[PDB]
Ligand SMILES: C[C@@H](O[C@H]1OCCN(Cc2nc(=O)[nH][nH]2)[C@H]1c1ccc(F)cc1)c1cc(C(F)(F)F)cc(C(F)(F)F)c1
Ligand SMILES: CCCCCCCC/C=C\CCCCCCCC(=O)OC[C@H](O)CO
Ligand SMILES: CCCCCCCC/C=C\CCCCCCCC(=O)O
């Protein structure tokens with residue numbers, strides 16, 4: 265069916281041209297602009313070079329040899345045709361693995377040193393050396409030979425009764441360039457994507473701009489709704505439990521403070537439900553003291569935003585706070601956090617943006633509450649401004665990192681999809697020989713696998729403003 269061959273040749277040429285043009289433009293965008301020269305972009309340039317080289321130097325003969333099963337192209341090209349794609353795919357997928365590892369280090373272990381640019385050039389050279397070494401056996405054993413009357417290019421391992429070495433080599437290459445790097449990148453981006461999503465906040469909602477009036481009028485109206493007169497107002501919200509959210513630590517701190525004269529000047533609002541003994545202890549402290557209020561009913565997020573914008577301080581005595589979104593919610597609304605120095609709370613709150621204490625120590629928490637009462641004698645506006653600025657700038661870095669990580673996840677998923685049918689096609693004989701319309705299926709599977717060399721520049725242009733601007737500059741001639 266010659267018309268099908270014409271359509272297939274057109275599709276393969278579309279692969280070649282799109283891959284070469286887009287990857288060359290990506291290399292120009294990164295290398296020619298000093299702002300673009302980063303660790304991540306260097307690994308991306310290495311991957312773009314590997315993919316453009318494979319599309320430029322293998323696609324045409326792969327198509328022609330798949331369509332016309334006689335080798336006319338010489339011995340050295342037979343070796344290169346069996347050698348280069350393994351090295352190129354290895355170099356590209358491990359450049360992507362290095363990008364994911366650099367992101368995981370910057371986000372999960374910020375204190376630990378990362379690669380310098382020269383270190384990344386060294387890593388890229390090591391990657392290419394390992395790629396060439398892994399590809400070497402397949403190119404070394406390739407030869408042209410009559411089979412028995414017409415020339416073919418074929419991999420000829422030394423004759424062994426079970427061909428065990430060639431089989432183990434193929435399995436190892438498939439693991440090293442597909443399954444293992446995908447598992448590693450999947451772990452890295454799962455941890456990173458969960459940690460970033462758990463640290464995000466909706467700034468369109470948790471925003472002081474939707475409150476009305478001065479903070480003092482709001483706090484007075486709130487205390488009046490609770491039946492209390494004006495005072496320095498502390499708020500807790502969370503589940504009542506032992507060993508987790510710390511409401512028991514806050515209740516012990518309230519009992520410690522209750523004997524002091526300073527307790528007269530404080531007000532407490534404890535919101536949550538859970539362990540009945542803790543609920544009964546909170547109701548006992550509420551009836552015992554006129555400056556304590558407890559709310560076990562569920563509240564709307566609008567009412568909680570009103571509370572965050574009215575109270576003076578929010579107490580977060582968590583034993584365990586991996587992400588600390590509640591601290592961002594309070595700080596965005598101008599409440600000053602008083603929190604255990606654990607996890608995301610320790611990462612977000614600073615000495616200038618809150619008060620931090622050891623988790624599980626009621627006496628240190630009572631001392632921090634007394635320190636907050638001492639701070640309340642003076643104006644707190646600069647403190648709340650620092651809390652708001654810190655919460656905004658933190659949210660901000662999280663959002664940009666989420667964009668970059670989403671782009672890289674789209675890249676890795678496109679790679680996994682494009683290469684799965686190819687490796688399945690070459691692993692099927694080991695579990696079921698079959699292979700008896702195979703040529704039409706092979707042209708489709710090969711087209712999909714090699715199409716992977718053209719998607720990344722398209723992906724960068726859609727999901728990255730800098731690459732989009734670089735593509736606009738490269739194509740300024742066009743409308
Ligand atoms: C060179 C060719 O390789 C296959 O065809 C020959 C036999 N070879 C298994 C074998 N090797 C022996 O020594 N005996 N049998 C196959 C194979 C090799 C390594 C694998 F991981 C999976 C399959 C290949 C490989 C890739 C890859 F490697 F990047 F995926 C991509 C492409 C291209 F995109 F251009 F079309 C072409
Ligand atoms: C917007 C601009 C649009 C421009 C549109 C045209 C772009 C053509 C450029 C590169 C494609 C060709 C790259 C090289 C392809 C080589 C084909 C080949 O013969 O491969 C040699 C290899 O050694 C064994 O075949
Ligand atoms: C980016 C760098 C790319 C370099 C590619 C170099 C070309 C590789 C092609 C074939 C290498 C395999 C060599 C096999 C030699 C066999 C000699 C013999 O059997 O006598």
Ligand SMILES: CCCCCCCC/C=C\CCCCCCCC(=O)O
Nearest residue numbers: 454455457458461584585586587607
């Ligand atoms: C040290 C702090 C530990 C915090 C643990 C928090 C609980 C979550 C931990 C592991 C669950 C991982 C499940 C990932 C499944 C994929 C989810 C997805 O696709 O988005």
Ligand SMILES: CCCCCCCC/C=C\CCCCCCCC(=O)O
Nearest residue numbers: 674678681682712719722723726727
């Ligand atoms: C034939 C199968 C090909 C598989 C790859 C498909 C092409 C993917 C390339 C670009 C698509 C990128 C879209 C990613 C989500 C964008 C979300 C958004 O724009 O907000």
